[model samples]
Target: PPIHTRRQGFDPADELRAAGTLTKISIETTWLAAGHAVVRQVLGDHQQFSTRRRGKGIFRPRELVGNLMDYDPPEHTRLRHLLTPGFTQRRMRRLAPRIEEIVTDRLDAMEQAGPPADLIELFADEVPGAVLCELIGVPRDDRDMFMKLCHGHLDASLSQKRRAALGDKFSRYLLAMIARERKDPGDGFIGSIVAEHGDTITDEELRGVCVQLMLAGDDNVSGMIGLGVLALLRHPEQIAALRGDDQSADRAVDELIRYLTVPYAPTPRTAVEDVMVADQVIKEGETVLCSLPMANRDRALLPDADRLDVTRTPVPHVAFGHGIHHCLGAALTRLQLRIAYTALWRRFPALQLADPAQEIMFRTSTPAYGLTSLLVAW
Candidate 1:
């Protein structure tokens, strides 16, 4: 019997669920490939899966969507170098105190709001948006507008008509911010980039990078925090272990990231050249969608992979991805998560999910998997 099976379906999620372990399906789409093969091939051969062009032909208005994250080598390498300095270990560490402050402030507000608070709205969403704005030096007055624009851009389910309208709006918002930063550089990443790269990067490029950071920073941290709390709640023993000691939070966060795998898929890439992936042929220009969630669950890479073990060791999961394109904000996101959970648990030791997990809405169609809202009480 063959290890991989084929199916015919329009819904990728349905196909993924049906595939069971690892399977392929033939769709009418020109670039379709097995999800596992896509991940393996790309990780195995970076040269072939080119992310140079705009991803999967998705329209990002005013070219604001394509940034360093969507480019291939040489260009990718150059852009990454220019941006990586802002996210260095020292810089992230410096931001740790600020991160703790942000979390504490949010927790304080939540306490005032009383129990049965929406964690998704209170901490998960606010902490990251506030932190990213702080890091980028986005003014306090303008942070709300910036956050809304960034959110509109990342929503994958927006109708094309809506996308067009929102895209124009998002572009205009970014341009305005860029103009202000250029006129008098402030103290955020945007300011630093302007001072260093100064005129080397176009207005469009500047906006693209800012939008990328906003989108990347906001969603991942929010989703991780929300999902991490839920995961801990699901496992009472693990929650007790974490609450019993502050040190366990880091390990718990890592385990939740690996297990939940919020960013279920990698950004789609086109194969620039023919490549062999796991004895399979990936033709040129074909679309390869990497199943990050599935890969994390693979037994080959993890022992007892199906079980959620907070103490699991030697976890080499690619939750942030692999190689040069790995997430630049991973360190900061981790810091935010650790701080948020520690503060929440300490403040509300009796906190518990107010609703059943099944009743909580999970985003199914969006490129990123997360909750719409999570109700909790002390």
Candidate 2:
């Protein structure tokens, strides 16, 4: 691995698709994953790489996640501790019934619309949006509006002009919601943040967290659902196998998340000091991009690396990130996926892809990976 160098301004996915393994490039003005080993080592040894410095670009990592993912040591530990209770297994279990209802409602609507439906547009998109909206106490009327705003903001293909405009609107929406939450605290996550933190967390911080929750809570889960469907559809026999046994689907979902690794971009981190990894020297302040997708698919870690096996004994994967930055919302995501797919398969026993699988377009511009539309028929 002689640090596979290439010209500047290439999509990492291009390399991955071509090589079917890791590749490294120079740390330029824009972001790039340092390399798989560098990322793993840096993440494991937090002292070498620090997330305290804000990431370059439009969004600030610390601000977005309420200082949850960016902070380290005492600060990171404290904030994470405060947020832990919000995502406990007990809380997620309590929310399961509501999650099931939300899934059923979306599926019913899709059923009414008849077949040849886009699952990504219908069930995948709506399930996470509605579940998170309900959890955060966002008014049902505003859920669709907020989802549109979030979707626009996250769309990388949108012109910078459009993105900034939508970003402003998103900020305004969050501020308005925060004000409402302040006036009448409800039994939801947003209200809980207000009740617990009070004014210590500024409106901007609150808005950022809301955006973060919306993005993290929606995009990744939706990607998983879409990819899960795509995987099942690709292997129709797997669908029949899983339909007969719920446990089979459960295992398949886990494997799909590992195999798909939707957030293919390396999470951005900054080197705190000079470090050597895989024969390359990284200077201080240099950016370290950890390729979660690459790491997940590494042949060294996974036997028969590229194949999608539903019963692979649950090897650890970084699809939800790793270490201190591991997804705080993992429990909720798992619960929603488990419930959604389980109910979905059971309800539409004859569901199958409507169009040729190869003809279906996949989203490439967005940092998140998923289908543009997954048309299915029963």
Candidate 3:
């Protein structure tokens, strides 16, 4: 019923693959760029395609204010520059101790709760929220409230009015945090940016970036954790790879990200100028939506792309997107998953679905792809 809902299987590989690399899906308006090369070409060419919406679309004026996705270069570059330092590999590693603690704490809670547990609720959901709070420097007491606002703000089921109200509350909370972080720059994500840039960055920008980070980090990581576990259970042979050495775990994590392909599509790109994508003339100003899952499944991208194989060397996938707009949280996400999956399997070697025959509830009514609830046992 909802627009974002997936019509087919969890991955939607076949339908997308059959749709051809580039096609005008409806009335010569929006273009569906599915092939690996064509999708990459569209995303990479900022000069010809614009992320900022020109006419009426879903995003409201307030929502557009500080979001990096709604801006083109020079401005996008400036905003991204202010925030990039905090997401570096080194900076993400700084959170490793806390991430490990967060993952371990969740595992401990899951153990205490015992199995036939909803992994989504007990572990998948908690770890990412806690990690984001730590990254944003949300105080221990306010973590729950902060998480509630984020979930509320991002929930598609909520009416726009209700979600906007929730967004207002979220913004006010972030503004206060920005003020506090400005006065005293701690090692937190916001603090580090304020500390480094000082007066160069504004409160509005900081609030927007924080919103983006929370939205970007939470569900995707949670989805990966939940869906990834389901994938591993389906192919039990792959479970051990997650617990292997760094090299193997790295490969497994990348493979999972590629296979799951969460964060459905990048903000729709409008062609700034008429461009030839896969020999199709995407006329000026037409919308182009790249199917990350489809592109990853393209035969041009890899052999037997649909089949999940942890042992295969990882290929560059558009899961985190491509070009200047690539996800800034990539490093942090990888770190969290590596720790989470490893700790999860290591803690429960015999982990499995509570009922193998029960239908899996896929979370389709959201921007990211994941399970609504995964009942699992150790």
Candidate 4:
């Protein structure tokens, strides 16, 4: 309820920035850290700030709770370590070929469907959905059901009754997948974690883990895929330049991630005790919300924050959040973005907006900044 009213996909209110650092934006007494320096300060200090979740976060209550992102201190460290091995560069490198294959398959599907199709549906959403299914070891036949559960449970606009129903459905689906893994096991990320840890993790705990892993990164990567493509279409020169070299493509993806910075506020952090931030006293028990898009666009961090330069040198951006709670799937998501963006643009050299004058629908009402549907043609 403390969330600053957002409109048109992750655009922070003009009043929020001019409201000054550590200004009170919410009647709930929530503080919005709009400045780049202060946002980073609050996030980097976990001792003063906590990562606990108190309200709806893209899933039904009690259905998708108790993941590593919600913990603090030693317990957080321990739980994070358990899932770290499954996301290393080695694992990502091993999965790289499969990601290429997935991108190719999505392209194939899009081409088969012909032109002027919704890239969001035919290509953008499918890339990461297929990757998540593959990484989570969801059987090919069950991916449609799996994605339905994910999208339904995370749809913020859905009524509580509907979300709850979807939540129960997701639980049943996950429980079935877990049972399948129990009988035969798998070489994918979730199964690898299950196999290596054994009884240390329970079916319930693993259920929460599986949902969190999917929820935490799903909208983010998918939204980025959609917005990244749109940005490139608006900048045709950048698209042509991206077909330059791997390093340039690498920078392009990083810039796109920074430009969009989807997942607006990183689920908010609860203040543990009274702390001084932005020269203002943030009293104990008050919640702190960071404007990630605003921070990324802060002029102090970059010479021209608003400009999208795919050729610019790579710089640190908090699109993934800061500190111990940074997204675990960072590398995997980058791999997905790189493959999806470059290949999609490269393959459809003539790709252009089907109706440039028509307004594009953005998922602004939710946590992500993405197109509801992007009509494109070659």
Candidate 5:
């Protein structure tokens, strides 16, 4: 009955999409703001909903990943402003050449592997994996070690201690990257941040930000690429359409991000004051879940809400998120996906599922919903 999984007979978005508003949901009754309007209201009105929350263990602020998503108002504002320049159009353009090269290399790997490649391993994870590594200043030599911990850190298959061990190793690696940047900036995004902000930002703060950026990006974008490919495989016509001009390809990528909602919901928010959304009162101290999947699927937002249309005019969607805490990596994510989809299709027009009806593996119980391994052939 857990909503996170893709278990049969349970779709987490169904109830809220039909209701079109927040409603009390059980499993100890939390407020579920599944409708678009309510979700938007909760996201925008941060004054009423505080972003900070306690974790299971004792407070260890130093170890915490203090990225923009963890704070609100003055602190968040300052941090975001400091980092905005790092993610600007100019930076993205500079990174464009490298991103294309990464995706092209991934496609080359897929081609060389011959038929029946698992897209997640051969292509999906590698594209974003490589981009995020380079963008975040991960040294080429250290990439494999960092990636091993990263994948294991969130892996359900691992034991808790095993996961924590990976976390500890990853934490140490991140600190090293921070130290490296401090000594002499690496040729990556973190180095840029370090060069610009210099002693203004503490090594601890910079380390947290770098780790958060990697964790924030990796799985979600990787999942999107994997699922996005599966979706296209299902709708060959849409795939063909996306293979056209740049504008159409871009639109298809947007629709895919919206349709899949790789991250089913945003991080949970805690109510700071009595708040009213959709005429229902959420009391102070109550937890609110802004369901990204439900809101994106709302019929009010589009025609035939459940259907996937690559050319749905690309309306406003909360796939990246809403309000001030919107995804910092949005532009980079779009650029990567756009480039990946366009290049893959153009290179392999005969791309199709190795088993058309093969039971696709789902990464349920993950921070993002995705395909574990998609088998495909060119």
Candidate 6:
């Protein structure tokens, strides 16, 4: 495979800033909303700007069946509420011990492999996969295959037909798992839902939810971990800040997420009705693409937006997004990242890139921004 190097201009902040907030883009009827205020407004008002389509004949992927991000209010609200109980702060806390255990286990494996380890393989990629497995209660025996399916489905390098095949297999695996949960609900996220909302939620919806969870939670967190480590290695003091008090550490995690702002854009939203955003009138049926990274970096949101500052007090950045479709796993994602970064720095206090001069390979094709591989040593 050819190396997918990070592009010269990874962040579109400069171009976005020059684009005058709301401007016409070349993507047919789509408009780009870059300013923080307008982007937030566009995302906030789902009534005016719908996540779902208004007409038929549009090819809706079968995979989006239960995905909340693909739905609007009423349907979106119902699905989100049903799934809400599973991701509550208290529920995520239940998984804290498992998260720490998973992080420590990965660190142990990396330590055993000694220096010059591929952080993506040994840590970043592994931790989130295992945590998700644990969260959904994949049996210990099935986890390796489960992770493989999850990884296979997101591999942009794979041919479309091949990835679709993997997606089918992924759906099949979930179907069986959902069946088991329906019979006798276990304590994991899936089983908890089956136990609580049995018969009310269909198997198809559960399968879709699993796919969405795997899609939303896995690569995004993994990307953040790989990219977050790279960011911290560049500024070692930030590593120490991650190791600081919980208050400071949490702030640092939010800063890293905001700075990285992975998942290039939320699902494109179509204007269901004409709406005035700033001075621009987004016509009904026209689509709006919110530039999440640019929105986070807007001067109106905060000053010194381009620089990576781990100590920056948390702002209402749209990294996890704003409004109705805000990421469902925001709390869980934050917890995973906080524990992963803190534990990693603690385990390998002297960790640094194996070859800082070598050109780093960034995942430019995948839905999220991350490293293809990162070599690190203590």
lDDT per residue as tens, model 3, 157-195: 899999989988998999998998889887877877878
TM-score for each prediction? 0.83, 0.81, 0.93, 0.90, 0.90, 0.91
lDDT of 1 by residue, 1-378 (tens): 111121111112444544543334343323333344345557546777776554322343445344665666766676777775566676777788888888888998899899888988888878988999877677779877777767666566887777677778888877888888888886567677777777666777777787778777767777778877877787777776466564576777787787877775666677787877666676787776666776776677776765788876647677788777887877776777778887888899988988665486665544566777888999
Better of 4 and 5 by TM-score: 5
- Residue 201 local lDDT, model 4: 60
Residue 24 lDDT in model 1? 45
Give a tens-digit lDDT track for model 5, residues 28-125: 75777878778888887889987775442124365564666667787778778777657867788888898999898888898898887888998887
The TM-score obtained by model 2 is 0.81
Q: List the residue pairs that clash in candidate 1.
A: none
Compose the digit string of candidate 2's lDDT tens values, residues 5-106.
Answer: 221111235454454222344545323443345456766677787776654323555444564556666666656665554565666767888898899899
How close to the true structure is residue 32 of candidate 6, measured as C-alpha lDDT? 78
Regions of model 1 farther than 4 Å from truth: 1-23, 26-41, 53-61, 64-66, 152-173, 183-186, 244-247, 355-358
- Using lDDT as the measure, the top candidate is 3
Q: Order the candidates by TM-score, highest first — what do you get?
A: 3, 6, 5, 4, 1, 2
Total clashing pairs for each candidate: 0, 1, 0, 0, 0, 0
- Predicted candidate 6 versus true structure: per-residue lDDT over 1-378, tens digit per residue: 111112233455344456667778765567878789998998898879888744221255665788787788787877888876577676888889989999999999999999989999889988888888877778889989988888798688899999889988988999998898889876778777867778678888888888777777878998999989988887776777886788888888999898888877788898888888888788888988887887887988899888889887889999888998888788888888899999998999888889879778888777788888988899
Steric clash pairs (candidate 5): none
TM-score of 1: 0.83
Q: Which has the better lDDT: candidate 3, or candidate 4?
A: 3
Error of 2 at 368 (Å): 0.9
Tens digit of per-residue lDDT, candidate 4, span 1-378: 334545434355565556666688765668888778898888889989987766433343565354876777676776677766567677788788889999999899989999989999888777777798777778888888888888897688899999889989999988887877866776776677777775666677678888887877777788898888888887778996568787888888888888878867876788888898977888888898888877888888899887888889877788888888887888888788888887886788889999889788887655677888888889
- What is the C-alpha local distance difference test score of candidate 1? 0.70
Alpha carbon lDDT at 264, candidate 1 = 57
Candidate 4: clashing pairs of residues: none
The ten-residue window of minimal lDDT in model 5 covers 4-13
**Candidate 4 or 2, higher TM-score:** 4
Q: What's model 3's TM-score?
A: 0.93
Model 4's alpha-carbon lDDT is 0.78
Top candidate, metric TM-score: 3
Better of 3 and 6 by lDDT: 3
